[PDB]
Amino acid sequence: RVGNRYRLGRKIGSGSFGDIYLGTDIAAGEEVAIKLECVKTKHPQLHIESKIYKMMQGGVGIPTIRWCGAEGDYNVMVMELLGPSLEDLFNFCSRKFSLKTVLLLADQMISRIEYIHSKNFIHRDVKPDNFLMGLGKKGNLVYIIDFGLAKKYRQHIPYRENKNLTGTARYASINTHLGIEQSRRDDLESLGYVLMYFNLGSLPWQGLKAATKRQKYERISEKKMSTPIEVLCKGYPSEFATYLNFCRSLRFDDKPDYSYLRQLFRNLFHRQGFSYDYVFDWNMLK
Ligand SMILES: Nc1nc2ccc(Cl)cc2c2nc(-c3ccco3)nn12
């Protein structure tokens, strides 16, 4: 049905482009994820994205690419199957994660972004939907997915005001709202909003009354730029505000101090007396 040995299953959703299906590797007896893209699409991207995954073969928490080709009306990318997204798991946990789960996630999510940056790419759409847990023996590993909006950042790319937002407004950095070209800092500031999102259940710039699309964006930018970090993070450990302030202070072409940021949450993890056993909130559902 696909690539001689793959059976296409049911659609499970969409990425930044193309649609994702469940499938079966018939020869290996393993479930897989299959991404489809119309061959006649005006802006073909799937083969571009597969090159990025291929170049990240072997990275921790990077999905493995099993096959990439064309079939009928589609370009096809077959991937090892991953588990639920962090948004799915957040909902399954009643939109509340324990501090321990947030810190376990933060440690891995910072490392995933650092790895992407070490390969000269910026992700540009850091959000809960793009982090998936592994399945089975890899169920303790947070994976990052979807490089459809990713961009090579290096010789660093020049300072620019590449207007218009490509990623999601909810987690976009303030500099993105100002129309500045995204760089490494912006992936990390976005992660900072995702972590407070997990702590709060929502962000203060969600659900703002707006009539049209452009107005909706204005309201989000204005609320985000008028909400002090200390107000956003009030009631939660100071490390989250320290993290966001550090990212907001980074210069366009600065290499972030990833280790410092991981050690921030690590020291908190230790002061709480938590055990680093990968027992996340959802693992405790009976
Ligand atoms: N289970 C699953 N494994 C994957 C493995 C590799 C890659 Cl690269 C993507 C996915 C993937 N994407 C989605 C999805 C659901 C709704 C929208 O996208 N699920 N999914």
Side-chain angles (χ1 to χ4, degrees), residues 1-154 156-159 161 163-212 215-285:
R1 172 162 286 276
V2 164
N4 195 37
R5 66 185 273 178
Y6 303 104
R7 172 191 183 84
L8 186 73
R10 298 287 310 271
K11 185 179 162 170
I12 56 184
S14 293
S16 64
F17 72 97
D19 293 321
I20 310 298
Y21 296 73
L22 269 156
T24 309
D25 181 342
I26 295 306
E30 288 164 357
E31 292 285 294
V32 293
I34 303 177
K35 184 164 191 172
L36 302 187
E37 172 191 70
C38 304
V39 295
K40 296 189 175 177
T41 184
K42 193 183 181 185
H43 311 279
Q45 294 184 58
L46 188 56
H47 288 279
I48 291 152
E49 192 184 18
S50 61
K51 284 165 68 76
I52 300 170
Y53 281 120
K54 178 180 178 181
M55 177 272 287
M56 292 171 178
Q57 264 276 36
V60 178
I62 301 297
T64 296
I65 178 173
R66 303 164 73 110
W67 186 78
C68 188
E71 200 75 20
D73 291 339
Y74 299 105
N75 292 310
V76 183
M77 188 175 70
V78 182
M79 314 287 287
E80 70 160 2
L81 186 65
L82 301 180
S85 79
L86 292 186
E87 182 66 18
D88 293 335
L89 294 165
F90 195 52
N91 287 321
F92 229 85
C93 295
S94 301
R95 307 193 58 82
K96 192 174 296 191
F97 284 158
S98 67
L99 177 58
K100 181 184 167 174
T101 283
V102 177
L103 297 177
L104 289 174
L105 292 172
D107 186 63
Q108 290 198 44
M109 294 166 86
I110 297 167
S111 289
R112 300 297 159 260
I113 291 172
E114 177 176 15
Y115 175 80
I116 291 166
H117 294 173
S118 81
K119 299 297 185 179
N120 310 312
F121 276 92
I122 52 173
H123 187 278
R124 300 207 304 182
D125 199 10
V126 165
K127 63 184 176 176
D129 283 321
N130 282 338
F131 292 91
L132 273 59
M133 300 305 299
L135 290 168
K137 289 297 193 292
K138 293 289 166 67
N140 295 327
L141 207 56
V142 182
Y143 287 72
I144 186 160
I145 63 164
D146 201 311
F147 292 83
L149 297 176
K151 173 178 172 60
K152 220 147 184 303
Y153 74 87
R154 62 180 180 188
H156 206 280
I157 51 167
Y159 193 81
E161 259 86 52
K163 186 172 177 183
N164 298 76
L165 166 62
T166 48
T168 311
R170 190 190 294 177
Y171 309 106
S173 70
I174 278 159
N175 279 325
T176 296
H177 282 293
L178 297 176
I180 297 163
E181 190 82 53
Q182 288 176 79
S183 66
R184 288 174 286 194
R185 59 188 181 174
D186 298 289
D187 281 345
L188 291 178
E189 178 176 334
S190 291
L191 177 59
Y193 298 132
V194 172
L195 298 175
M196 280 307 309
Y197 170 79
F198 288 156
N199 283 326
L200 293 161
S202 65
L203 293 164
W205 43 86
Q206 285 183 247
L208 301 185
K209 302 170 205 180
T212 58
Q215 202 164 22
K216 195 73 175 184
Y217 189 98
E218 289 176 354
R219 294 303 109 78
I220 294 168
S221 174
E222 290 162 7
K223 187 63 167 172
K224 202 178 272 171
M225 297 186 65
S226 74
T227 297
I229 286 168
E230 71 197 308
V231 177
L232 178 69
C233 303
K234 183 171 209 288
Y236 292 89
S238 63
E239 282 80 3
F240 293 99
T242 299
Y243 176 106
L244 277 166
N245 277 313
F246 183 93
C247 299
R248 277 286 302 150
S249 295
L250 287 165
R251 296 173 297 193
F252 176 74
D253 66 357
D254 278 343
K255 178 180 187 176
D257 193 345
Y258 307 95
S259 304
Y260 166 73
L261 297 170
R262 278 190 300 271
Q263 193 63 36
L264 202 57
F265 291 127
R266 195 166 292 157
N267 291 340
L268 174 59
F269 193 94
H270 182 268
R271 291 197 315 277
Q272 295 280 333
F274 296 153
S275 176
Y276 204 107
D277 59 5
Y278 311 104
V279 177
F280 306 92
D281 292 335
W282 52 90
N283 297 136
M284 303 293 234
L285 300 171

